Amino acid sequence: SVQQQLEALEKSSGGRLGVALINTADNSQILYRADERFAMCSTSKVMAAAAVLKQSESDKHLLNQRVEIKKSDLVNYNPIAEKHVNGTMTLAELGAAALQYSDNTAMNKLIAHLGGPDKVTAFARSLGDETFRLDRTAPTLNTAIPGDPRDTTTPLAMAQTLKNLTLGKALAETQRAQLVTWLKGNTTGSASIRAGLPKSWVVGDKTGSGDYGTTNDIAVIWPENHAPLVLVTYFTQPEQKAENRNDILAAAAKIVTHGF
């Protein structure tokens, strides 16, 4: 069965695997450790971007607001922000960079604009997500220490919130569509969930990786002839310097979408 296949995969991999699939045709679910907490790592960047999109529902000028990028703003991984040092980026551009390239400076600028990680958490709560918590900025939110509740959520909570953000009632239509455009244009996920799916399916996703070999992806999936699927795959390991394992996320995706 699917459950037996995921257990075997987890056992052989030497870690802890969390999966939540929602089939929006009938709201059926495939769950595996879906109520356990996992470190989100950069998958949290979806919530920071969405919180700024929510602000833009009531403030037409916001997304074109310019933010200065200085050398001191740069942290450990900033492929887009580094190209704009001593220039500006708009909040929309920062949203795009955080999601499509996982730029950590872009994330921190969004958080600073919102007023801190607690403001991202409050946004999640406003959507009915009582599980999500953001505690730190980038890159320290990727420490992924076993048992640490900081910067964690559960696979099921994240699947439900992602469904609400991209297909449901969380955002007004213009904003919903913008988030979906950004996720579809992700450049970092080729070897993760996408690699376990039919090539012709359309995928929007956000990856994240951190210490303890923590390797995550959250995705919305549009099949060619069926209703969308929402899939969260979280994976973490017991040793701090473990290799990341995008291949395990691809394998899990293949397992839970099979037959269909």
The binding site consists of: 206-208
The distance of closest approach from Cβ of residue 205 to ligand CEF in the complex, given in angstroms and rounded to an integer, is 10
Query: Which region, judged by CB under 6 A, interacts with ligand CEF, from 14-22, 171-179, 208-216, 233-241?
Result: 208-216
Residue 152 β-bridge partners: 39
Count of residues near ligand CEF by CB under 6 A: 14
204 binds ligand CEF (CB under 6 A): no
Phi–psi pair at 27, nearest 5 degrees: 60, 25
The distance of closest approach from Cβ of residue 33 to ligand CEF in the complex, given in angstroms and rounded to an integer, is 20
Strand pairing class (16-23; 28-32): antiparallel
42 binds ligand CEF (CB under 6 A): yes
CA angle 101, 185, 93 (to 5 degrees): 55
Contacting residue, 65, 139, 167, 254, with ligand CEF by CB under 6 A: 139
Separation between Cα atoms, residue 154 and residue 168, nearest integer Å:
19
Annotated binding-site residue numbers for substrate: 206-208
Q: Name the token pair of 146.
A: 């076993």
DSSP label of 260: -
142 binds ligand CEF (CB under 6 A): yes
- Of the candidates 226, 91, 221, which has an alpha carbon nearest to the alpha carbon of residue 162? 221
Terminal Cα-to-Cα distance of the chain (whole angstroms):
14
44, 141 Cβ separation under 8 angstroms: yes
Phi–psi pair at 90, nearest 5 degrees: -80, 165
77 binds ligand CEF (CB under 6 A): yes
The distance of closest approach from Cβ of residue 187 to ligand CEF in the complex, given in angstroms and rounded to an integer, is 9
The distance of closest approach from Cβ of residue 131 to ligand CEF in the complex, given in angstroms and rounded to an integer, is 19
Contacting residue, 210, 228, 255, 256, with ligand CEF by CB under 6 A: 210
Active site includes 72? Answer: no
The distance of closest approach from Cβ of residue 229 to ligand CEF in the complex, given in angstroms and rounded to an integer, is 21
Separation between Cα atoms, residue 99 and residue 120, nearest integer Å:
15
Of 1, 12, 13, 42, catalytic: 42
Separation between Cα atoms, residue 235 and residue 259, nearest integer Å:
24
Q: With respect to ligand CEF, which residue has the nearer C-beta, 64 or 76?
A: 76
Q: Name the token pair of 101.
A: 């390239």
Query: Which region, judged by CB under 6 A, interacts with ligand CEF, from 2-10, 120-128, 156-164, 203-211?
Result: 203-211
Of residues 181 through 200, those in contact with ligand CEF by CB under 6 A are 188
**Catalytic residue ranges:** 42
Using CB under 6 A, list all residues that contact ligand CEF: 41-42, 76-77, 102, 104, 139, 142, 188, 207-210, 244
